[PDB]
Amino acid sequence: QSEAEKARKELLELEALSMAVESTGTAKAEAESRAEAARIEGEGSVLQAK
Amino acid sequence: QSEAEKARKELLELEALSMAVESTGTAKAEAESRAEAARIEGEGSVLQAK
Structure with missing residues (x-):
């Protein structure tokens, strides 16, 4: 043993x-999938606010 | 093993x-599908407001 x-x-x-x-x-x-989706939503919201 | x-x-x-x-x-x-649909709706709403 x-x-x-x-x-x-x-x-x-x-x-x-x-x-x-x-x-x-x-x-x-x-982690990285949700970070990428959050980046996409943020870059979208800038243009939507414009 | x-x-x-x-x-x-x-x-x-x-x-x-x-x-x-x-x-x-x-x-x-x-993410990108909803970003594109939001872009379409925003560009539409500018013309609708005009």
């Missing part, structure tokens, strides 16, 4: 990077 | 870009 845990430490190291990528991708996508 | 996670990290990297594209496309389309 000591050697099994020595390898399992490395697996748990790699799953950390996988979970980091899988969380930051969802966060970045859902 | 360590090597399987080393490849799964790369798959999770690519799915991030796919999810980013799939979210920003829907956001950009639904």
Whole structure:
């Protein structure tokens, strides 16, 4: 079980990077889509006010 | 499982870009259509007021 845990430490190291990528991708996508839609609505509202 | 996670990290990297594209496309389309319709209504209302 000591050697099994020595390898399992490395697996748990790699799953950390996988979970980091899988969380930051969802966060970045859902943020940037709403930022782009807000930019479109603002640039529209300038012309609508004119 | 360590090597399987080393490849799964790369798959999770690519799915991030796919999810980013799939979210920003829907956001950009639904924003720009309403911006164009608002432009049409504004340019109409100028002439209607004249």
